[PDB]
Amino acid sequence: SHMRKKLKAVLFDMNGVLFNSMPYHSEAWHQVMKTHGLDLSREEAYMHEGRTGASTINIVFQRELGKEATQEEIESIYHEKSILFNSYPEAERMPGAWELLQKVKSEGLTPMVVTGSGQLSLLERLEHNFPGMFHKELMVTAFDVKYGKPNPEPYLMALKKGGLKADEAVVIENAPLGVEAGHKAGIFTIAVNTGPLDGQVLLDAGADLLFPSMQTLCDSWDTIM
Numbered sequence: 683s684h685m686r687k688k689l690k691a692v693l694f695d696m697n698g699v700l701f702n703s704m705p706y707h708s709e710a711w712h713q714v715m716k717t718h719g720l721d722l723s724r725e726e727a728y729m730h731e732g733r734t735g736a737s738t739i740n741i742v743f744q745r746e747l748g749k750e751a752t753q754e755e756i757e758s759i760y761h762e763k764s765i766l767f768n769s770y771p772e773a774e775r776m777p778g779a780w781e782l783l784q785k786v787k788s789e790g791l792t793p794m795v796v797t798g799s800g801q802l803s804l805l806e807r808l809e810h811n812f813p814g815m816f817h818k819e820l821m822v823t824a825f826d827v828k829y830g831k832p833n834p835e836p837y838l839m840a841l842k843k844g845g846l847k848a849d850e851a852v853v854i855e856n857a858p859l860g861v862e863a864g865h866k867a868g869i870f871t872i873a874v875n876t877g878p879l880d881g882q883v884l885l886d887a888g889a890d891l892l893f894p895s896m897q898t899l900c901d902s903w904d905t906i907m
């Protein structure tokens with residue numbers, strides 16, 4: 683209740699929060715890896731949600747083959763994963779995301795995007811799907827980071843870009859590595875379990891609140907702190 687008046691900004695992940703894109707991202711990781719000669723299950727792709735493509739790929743190479751991926755393997759796999767993602771009927775808005783962003787903006791809060799994604803098709807569609815909401819100066823993407831989630835790094839960058847202190851922001855995340863990153867950046871973190879995981883893993887990652895959907899979050903927004 684003290685900390686509600688402090689709030690200046692709401693920091694959203696994109697995949698699994700703004701867009702219902704994760705069934706596609708997991709499918710694509712799995713398929714591109716299969717094609718390369720590596721086993722990456724759809725469930726495990728979900729566990730890597732938040733990491734850079736480069737990080738995801740390297741980790742999977744270590745676990746499966748006992749070696750680093752080369753820069754060329756990384757660029758090739760990542761480019762293919764993107765082609766494959768773009769082959770599916772374009773991902774739609776998560777139900778509740780746009781209603782929530784209207785609530786946030788009417789409360790005078792600044793929306794931000796903090797994503798580990800580099801998917802240009804989705805980043806360019808932010809304006810078309812949530813008009814007037816986001817600005818490129820107030821976003822953090824895969825293009826900005828050296829390490830990425832679950833390194834607090836991208837949310838630390840977001841606080842800096844927004845001229846914010848950790849207590850002036852809230853994080854909305856759906857994936858454990860992202861919840862971790864927000865938490866370790868010292869920001870109050872709301873988890874929304876939009877994926878196929880036990881909500882417990884989101885609490886274990888440091889989430890302050892847990893909601894089952896973006897819609898239910900939106901409904902309870904006004905009763906929070």
Ligand SMILES: [Cl-]
Pocket residue numbers: 735798799800801
């Ligand atoms: Cl991506």
Ligand SMILES: [Mg+2]
Pocket residue numbers: 695696697698699731732855856857860
């Ligand atoms: Mg996400």
